[PDB]
Structures are given as C-alpha cells and as structure tokens.
C-alpha cells in the first residue's frame, strides 16, 4: 500500500485523516476508493491555500494500480513521481500576490466585489444575490477572510498564509528547545547559530511532503437557506478561524513529531 | 406580399416598426429577413406582456410562402393561421396571476428576491451582485416594475396590464363621450348599462362587424408592458437603473395612449 | 524583609535554598542568620564558577539591617547596592582565561599538579600526599575537572563555563517554544529574527540577578578516610557532575519560570 | 676559652666542625657567635640521631660567660652542666622504638605515607605532593631510611641506630682484636665471658678510669643518623632523590667509621 501509504501522508499535510490505506484493505472497488480520494484532495486543497477554488480537483487509481491527480479532468500529476513533482505541477496554475493571497476568483470570470466592501452591503448580497465573490479582506488575528456563493453552496474562507520554510523552522524550533539532553540541545542551538534550526536539525529533505505543502487557509461550507442567513455567515466565519487555528496546530505538531 | 403585411401590421399592436414588407419587396437573401423578423418579434414580446422572457422567441420563413413563429425551437403557428391562432398559441405558456402580472422568472430556476426592496438593497444587488432578478412591486395603481440582469444586460419591466378587451373597452369609452349626437350618446350608454360598454358600441357598428374586427391583430394583442435595457457600465449604475424606470414608465403610458387613440378612431370610423 | 528576599534570590540563581527571609521571620538572632547567610554564600561560590577558591566568602548583618558580602573578611559589597555592584566588586578579584575556567590555584601558592595527569598518579596523590591540587582537566559531557585537598577535606569541582548571556538566550528560547497563543509566539520569534530572543522577551534587565550569575560549576566535598579512598573521589567526582546537570536544569527552568 | 673547646669537642662527635673557639678567640660580636652556635647545634642534631626534628634547637651566649641550650625557645642545658646532664635534657623528649628509631613524625601532626612505598607511587609523591613524609624503611641490615619534604626543601634521612655504649662496646672489641699480648686477650676474652666486653676492657684501665671517661662526650653522644638535603627542583628529583639516599649511606658509614676509630685509639691509649 504504498501509493496509499504516500496519499495519506500528503493529506496529512493538510490535516486531512484520509485513511485510504485502509480503505483499500478492506478490499474496496476502484469508484469507493477514487470517490474517497477525491473527497480527501477537495478538503485538502480548501486548506493548502492554492487558490484554486476554480478547479475540479479529482483523484483517480490507474490501470497500473498508481494514483492520479487531475485539475477538471485533465491529468496533472502521478503519486509515485513525489510530492515535489505535484507541487510544481500545480505551480504554473497558480497566482498568489505579495501577500501569499490568490489573486484568481473562485468563480471564474464574472464580477467580484471589493475587499472592503461594508458589512451590511455584504448582507445584502448574503440574503438577496444569487452568486457573487468578495476580494480578500483583513481579518482578526494577521488573517485574511473571503466569501463566495456558487449555486445552493456558500463558501467562507479564511487564511494566513505561509511558506513551508517557516513552518518548518517553527518545528525545528519547538523541537530543539523540546530536546531532554541538555548538551545535545546546546550543541543544536550552536550550530543553529550558523545555520538556522534548518541545519541544525538536518545536520544531526524533498521527500518529506511537509516541505511543499502547509497549512495556509480552512474553507467553510453552508447550504440551503443557511447559505442565505447573515447569523450562519458569522458562524461559519467563526467556525473557519477556529478550524485555521487549530489544523494549523496540529500540523505544526505533527512536523515536530516527524522531525523528532 | 400580404403576409408580410399582416406581420407588420402584428408588430405595430406592439409598436414595432418592423418594414418586413419592405425588405421582402427589396429582395434580400433568406437570411437576412428572418433575423429582422425574429428581432422584431422578440422587441414585440417584451411589449405584448405574455411574460415569456424565459423562452427563446425566433420568426422564419417556410418553404410555402409564409412566416413560421417559433419558442424554444418548437413551432407554435403560421401567421396565415390568423392572429387569434397566434395567441391562443402563446396562452397555454402564460401563468398570470389575478393582476394581470406574469408568475414565471425572467432568469429560470434560481433565488428572486422580493419586490419593494428598499434602494439601498437594491443598490448593493445591482452594484455587487453577478446576476439577480426581482418579484414584481406591489403597484402604484395599474402600473407594475421588475428588474433583472442577465450577464452584462440590465432589463427593467414596467407594466400596465390590459387585456385586448380592455383597451378596446377603453377607446370604446372614448369614442362614446366624443359623439356629439347626445340622444345617440344617451342610448348607447342605456344600452350599456345591460351589455357593457364595447358590446353597447359593437351592437351599432356594421353587420358582421365582429367578423370584419377579428381579423385586424388588436383584437388579440395590445402594448401591456416596456422593458427598458441597460448595457455595460451603466447596467451597473442605480441612477441609471431608476432614470431607466421612468423612461420605460413614460414609455409605456406613451404607447398605451397611442394604442388607445388608435382603437377609439378605428370603432369610430367603423359605424 | 527585602535586603533578605534579595539575597534569596542572589542564591536561587546557585540553585540554594537559602531560605533566609523565612530564618528571619523566625525572630532568628544575628549570629544564627550570620551563620545561615555564610553557608548559603560560600554554597552559591561553589556554583557560580568565579574561582575564588582561595578566599574566605562570608555574610553578616550590619547595624543597619543590611546584608555585607566580606571576602577574606574585608568588606566586599553590600546586597542594597545591587546584584551587579557585586558582580562589579567580585570581576577584579577573578582571573579566567579563554575556556571560562578560573587561573587561580584553590591552595593559594604551592605546587599545582599538571591537568593532564594520569590517574593511577592521582590515586597515589589522594592515598599518600598531605595537600595537593590538579590544573583543569577535560571530562565528559564539554565539562571540566580539578580536585585538590586542604587538611581533612577534599573538593572535586566540575565545571562546564557558561556566561549569563547564553542562559538568557536559552532561556527566552524555551519560553518562545512554550508560547500557548499561536499568533503571539509567531510575532515573538519574527521579532527574534532581528533582536534575538532576548530583544523578542524584552521588547514584549540588570535588576535580575540571573543577568550577572549563573550556574557554571559544583563542588563536591569528602572527608575522614573517604578525603584518601580512590573510589570515593570517583564516586564523588560522578555525583559532581550529575549534579551540575541537575543545577543548571533548575537555573534554566526558574530563569524561564522568571522571564514568563 | 674552656667552655668553646668544650662545645667544639660536643660537636665533634656528631662530625661538626664548629670552631666555636677560634670565633671566640676572634672577639666576634655576640650575635654572630650565638648564630655559629645555633647552625652548628642544629647541624648535629641530625647525626645524632635523637629524633627531635620537630623541635626547634637553639644555643646562645648568656651574661655569666656559658652557653645555654635551647628547644622551642625553652632553657634545656648549660654546657658547663656536662655533657651528660644534656642527654639527660634530651631524654625525656625522644620516643624510640625496640629498633632505636624515632617514632615521631618530622613534620609534626598530620598524615604520614607508610615506608617501603614502591618507587612508583614515591616518585609521584616527590614530583607532585606539595609537603609529604614516609616512616621508617623494612631496614636493610640496622640500617634504616625515611625522607619527608617541608616547602622547598627534601630530607633523606638515613639512620643505624646506636648508643654511645654499642658504638664503645665495637671500638672495645676492636682493640681487643688489636691486641699483641695473647695471654692478655685471651684473659680479657674470659673476664668479658662474665662482664661484657666493654666492662672487661673498662676494668683493666686505668685507676678511676670510668670517672675520667664521663667528662668525655662521647660516652654519652654518637653519630646514629645522617640527613641529606636537597633544594629546589632537585627536592622534586626521585633521581636526586635515590642519590641523595647513596650518598647519606656512604657518610653515615664513614662517619660511624671514623667514631669507631677514635673510640678504639681513646680505650686503647687508655690503659
């Protein structure tokens, strides 16, 4: 189960319990194990931060018994060439400012409403707009937030985003400063000195899907007349913020595990 | 010759100016004269008030001579067959309710939010959002508004509805006040008192008259309604859409009138 | 009682427990608390690595109910000065060279044993010499040794030097690490990039007394037939050593307790 | 002029040479002459061998023309009491054991390494203990050894334990063997058969010999030790250590030497 071992390591990286391994020990058929791989690339790519909400993001299994990744239907990636290879395959289709924000529309070509639109023009819109986008806007906490409506769907997104370098020297610093031995710590936080906790850590990379893909945003979902209710919009912004926080945790802790 | 007489005279109920006769008599290729006809027959539509913005409204020449109508790609009549043809054609596709106002979306299956939503509501929809539509308000008098965007296209609707009747019992009205001969006049109007007014009238016109008056197109389509279009830039702009609503309001009671003056010296000069 | 609180805490940075407050509360008379402060002060000397091995350290109360600090009974500083103006009267009496390790011999003048003796000479020296001393000698662990007797007692001191500066520095490091707030914590190690830890902690010092002592080494004595057995002095040079583990764990733990 | 021989032939028998007389005869001031006094003093007192190297021995001049004899700067003798009467002074201060050897420690209180210490485990006590001290060796003979160290300067101390009366009962036997007159030896023989050998050579001497043979000091001292010392880095030397050892061996053997010869020419010339 390698090709699965290999998916469910870079869902992990989104914070995404995908347990495709096992699902396919328990002997499940080609169209189970490809609806579950794709359920777990759409929730994984509402937290990546890619911008890339425009897109179908499908997984299937192939003839040879690998896992494809495809951007509407269209063959992107393969597993078994590495996670790097994914990542720079869904670079060139990306658009990302000075901010680490998407400048693409999450619905395609069509109007978007200003960032800084007032709250209550946004109810407005919530209530009575049939589709409708907002540009990313400041929020609490170094956060940015945005909304969307695509047909019966509302989706709520908030993100601050983040290079996988920084997470990593996040971890690298957890785990150093987390280190029982004491001279081994001092010898560490040495060579840190030289070389960041980056080789310091090493020195005691590219396989590691942690090194391409971090958490940078969480996606919120409402349906039917909630998608409609300014109170399930504030919820939901809530619910994004709180789930930001707390993937992002867990993500950082399990980077420290896994460099530990 | 006739037929494309008879579609004019179809298009000038709705205050379309079509020339169909002229471009038929200047020998232009087929293709040419189905999109006039088609253009015209869907500027007449958003006139007639059916409420048939939903569908897809196209006018053709047949292999026979004539002018084939069709909705939605579907044949509905020959304009041979008669103009009642025509709109008994078109009422199965109607659901008016007891306003005389259309039930059906403008934008098909999708969220319409209320009439007499308040300008600042409405500004934001028409400032922010993509594609919207709204019921119809709740009237200032007869006279009626919607507003709907479809892509890059603002439509604003004020209408007045009437049936053929209606304005026909309107300009019957008319006609009975402007006669002069006062003892006629007065025994027109005892006449009505039991029949109604337009039956008071039709009952002292010629023999066969009710013959002679169903094949002339008011008798079944009248100006109900003005749409009012927005393009670009200014489908987006709340002063435009409100100044929109009032030229499609004065429009509207502009050719109502016109319509109205015109039936009064037609059941005048019949008897 | 604050000239006695500070001196508990001009001990606790040695890791004692001097406890001297709580002695005075006590109604303690003045040649008890003298007693206690001595014990304390001479304990606090064998930690604080300053070599000054050679001089008697002592304690007394004044007649106006401050704290003196006498150096072979000359008067040295006083507590209500500050912990640097002790610091300050202490440097001129010190000699270090580069490693951290004090030049003064502990005897005084006499011969000293070269550093890089063997043992089997040493045991003949611990079982057979009246008084001899050992230049420093590399151990385990980046830490250092000597031993040398005087009368009845012998004392084995490990040192591992460490300046104040790199236990500020390791500690800010631990307390940035232990930061619960996310957006907090990322803040603090951002402004680390260009301060350190130390302008992170600060922005967000010479009144401690952690700023001028630390723990650097531990002094382990042994008396009666035990200052002359080969395995005593092994036993108590291993119980040296875990012991200055143990003390500058404390150290670093209160000190991050402190900054907190 | 008596009591200056008097000291020189005290100092003699412990081979030193003080030639107090002849600075007194110099009219040397007294502080040079009580320092000559002390040196030499001190200077027998490690031959003779009465293990009183913790004590601090002194002689000095005093007002009625005698010398006074001192230990840690308490009054022991005057040398005008005889040459016994200062052993006597000397007496209870020693701590001899069946051996002859001094039990006390040359440095006073504190820890004393055991003798016979390998050369190993010495020659890193010489070259790294800062002030150290052994007991006395096995013996090789009646010949014993130890050494101490006090600041910069190391003491060999090698040691054949003898009392005046052991050093004149050898110089008697030799004598008797130097005798011609065989009856006389072989008489002599019998008597000291019965008498010990120093009692049958004593008895056959002259009137009230025994009398004229207390004011001798050498009936109450004799060399039983000799201390060789080193300096400086030398008293950090085990090589500088083991010669010192030889060369104290060879002189305490020469010394003891010359005093059996001159004991035997004194009995002999006797009587």
Redesign the interface.
């Known amino acids: 189960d390698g090709i699965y071992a290999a998916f469910d390591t870079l869902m992990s990286t989104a914070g995404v319990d995908s347990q495709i391994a096992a699902l396919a020990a328990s002997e499940a058929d080609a169209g189970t194990l490809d609806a579950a791989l794709t359920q777990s690339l759409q929730e994984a790519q509402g937290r990546w931060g890619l911008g890339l909400h425009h897109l179908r993001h499908e997984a299937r299994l192939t003839d040879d018994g690998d896992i494809e990744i495809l951007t509407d239907g269209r063959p992107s990636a393969r597993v078994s060439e590495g996670f790097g290879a994914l990542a720079q395959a869904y670079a060139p289709m990306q658009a990302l400012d000075e901010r680490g924000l998407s400048q693409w529309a999450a619905?395609g070509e069509?109007?978007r409403?200003?960032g800084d639109?007032p709250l209550?023009?946004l109810k407005?819109?919530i209530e009575?707009?049939?589709?409708?986008e907002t540009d990313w806007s400041a929020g609490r906490?170094?956060t940015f937030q945005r909304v969307w409506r695509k047909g019966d769907t509302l989706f709520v997104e908030v993100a601050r985003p983040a290079s996988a370098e920084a997470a990593l020297?996040?971890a690298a610093?957890?785990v150093?400063?987390?280190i029982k031995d004491?001279?081994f710590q001092?010898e560490l936080?040495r060579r840190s000195e030289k070389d960041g906790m980056l080789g310091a850590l090493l020195g005691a990379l590219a396989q590691l899907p942690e090194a391409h893909f971090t958490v940078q945003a969480f996606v919120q979902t409402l349906s039917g007349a909630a998608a409609?209710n300014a109170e399930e919009y504030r919820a939901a912004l809530k619910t994004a913020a709180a789930a930001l926080?707390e993937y992002?945790?867990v993500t950082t802790r399990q980077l420290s595990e896994v460099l530990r």
């Open positions: 619905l069509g109007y409403a200003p639109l209550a023009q407005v819109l009575h707009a049939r589709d409708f906490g170094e020297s996040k610093w957890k150093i400063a987390s004491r001279a001092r936080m409609r926080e992002q945790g």
